[PDB]
Ligand SMILES: Nc1nc2c(ncn2[C@@H]2O[C@H](COP(=O)(O)OP(=O)(O)OP(=O)(O)O)[C@@H](O)[C@H]2O)c(=O)[nH]1
Ligand SMILES: [Mg+2]
């Protein structure tokens with residue numbers, strides 16, 4: 001019986017510092033390389049317990065109990081308001097969450113939305129009150145524990161931190177939580193612990209990691225979920241074709257044990273795919289599976305929770321955002337297909353049928369672009385995953401007959417088929433493509449405004 005590696009989801013409002021926090025722990029620069037300077041996908045990173053203990057050093061004694069976890073699997077999530085469905089997926093996967101909140105800006109709309117998600121999935125969480133280094137006159141020392149760094153601050157900075165912390169505590173009370181600075185908490189099951197940190201300079205990461213490990217272990221012990229059992233269950237993050245590996249999928253395995261010869265069922269763009277794994281490859285520890293610096297290593301199995309790449313025949317048509325379910329018998333295959341269909345079908349995007357055509361590369365991207373258009377009262381004709389089809393172009397033309405404004409296709413991280421592009425040129429139907437949600441929408445609006453003039 002192997003010990004579970006817990007999923008730690010990182011949630012919070014746009015720019016409050018989620019990816020910077022993980023980059024400081026990994027010594028990576030994922031945030032610097034994100035297109036459009038925002039997270040737009042779920043990420044997964046293995047942080048071995050040896051790393052936790054090195055960062056924490058003597059502050060591991062902050063937590064009475066011995067930490068027996070093998071490590072932590074951190075799931076990064078988008079803050080941008082459109083990506084509600086990816087924040088929900090991250091919250092639903094988590095054993096414990098880190099709610100990142102800018103101590104200077106305080107609660108904002110996706111802080112509140114994240115809390116509602118954590119309440120919905122009854123996910124325990126710790127709070128990272130980030131960007132303390134912007135308090136006036138703050139004395140920065142890199143990678144210093146908060147309880148050491150706070151001693152370097154003058155009284156004005158200390159008083160400003162406490163004032164801002166009280167604002168956060170009042171906001172948590174508004175939403176039904178008792179919260180305090182982590183070193184003042186008396187009951188870690190009934191109270192929310194707030195760690196003041198600087199993600200960018202590494203202040204307070206030591207105490208934050210000790211609490212994450214301690215509290216996630218406690219959750220798993222309280223639930224009797226610390227031992228991993230059963231066949232593998234996961235969610236697909238990305239579908240890729242890679243030299244020497246073939247068509248692969250990068251996934252999060254959130255329960256059970258995945259083996260390199262397992263039969264699996266995965267969501268597909270047309271229909272469910274039943275295949276047998278031929279290789280598993282695991283990212284290096286501290287490498288973000290969605291933006292890796294290193295090639296992955298072949299492994300025979302992974303135990304939950306883990307990020308892993310799967311090589312198997314027939315994965316070219318796999319659908320990102322859909323389940324991967326190990327299915328060792330025919331009965332299991334039948335069950336897995338229905339569970340996959342339920343997940344796919346449930347993406348419900350209301351369409352006005354005199355509106356825009358929306359295509360995207362993953363289910364999470366399709367939902368985000370759809371949600372953002374609805375918020376902007378841009379009617380949606382149709383929304384589906386995959387490259388722009390000739391049909392998509394013909395449907396857009398029909399809309400164009402009724403209302404040229406909406407006789408358009410928006411393609412989020414997708415390509416245009418050749419016969420679709422031929423027809424679109426001949427019939428003068430516009431197709432917008434992009435890989436940054438806010439820029440794709442701005443491009444569609446700029447085209448609308450400028451055409452009217
Ligand atoms: N001064 C300061 N800036 C920070 C800190 N943490 C993050 N930032 C900065 O805030 C900006 C946004 O940081 P990100 O890590 O992308 O924030 P995020 O929460 O992951 O953002 P989204 O994923 O798009 O919601 C960047 O310019 C970071 O350098 C911090 O501790 N101090
Ligand atoms: Mg981010």
Ligand code: NA
Nearest residue numbers: 015037038039
């Ligand atoms: Na950002």
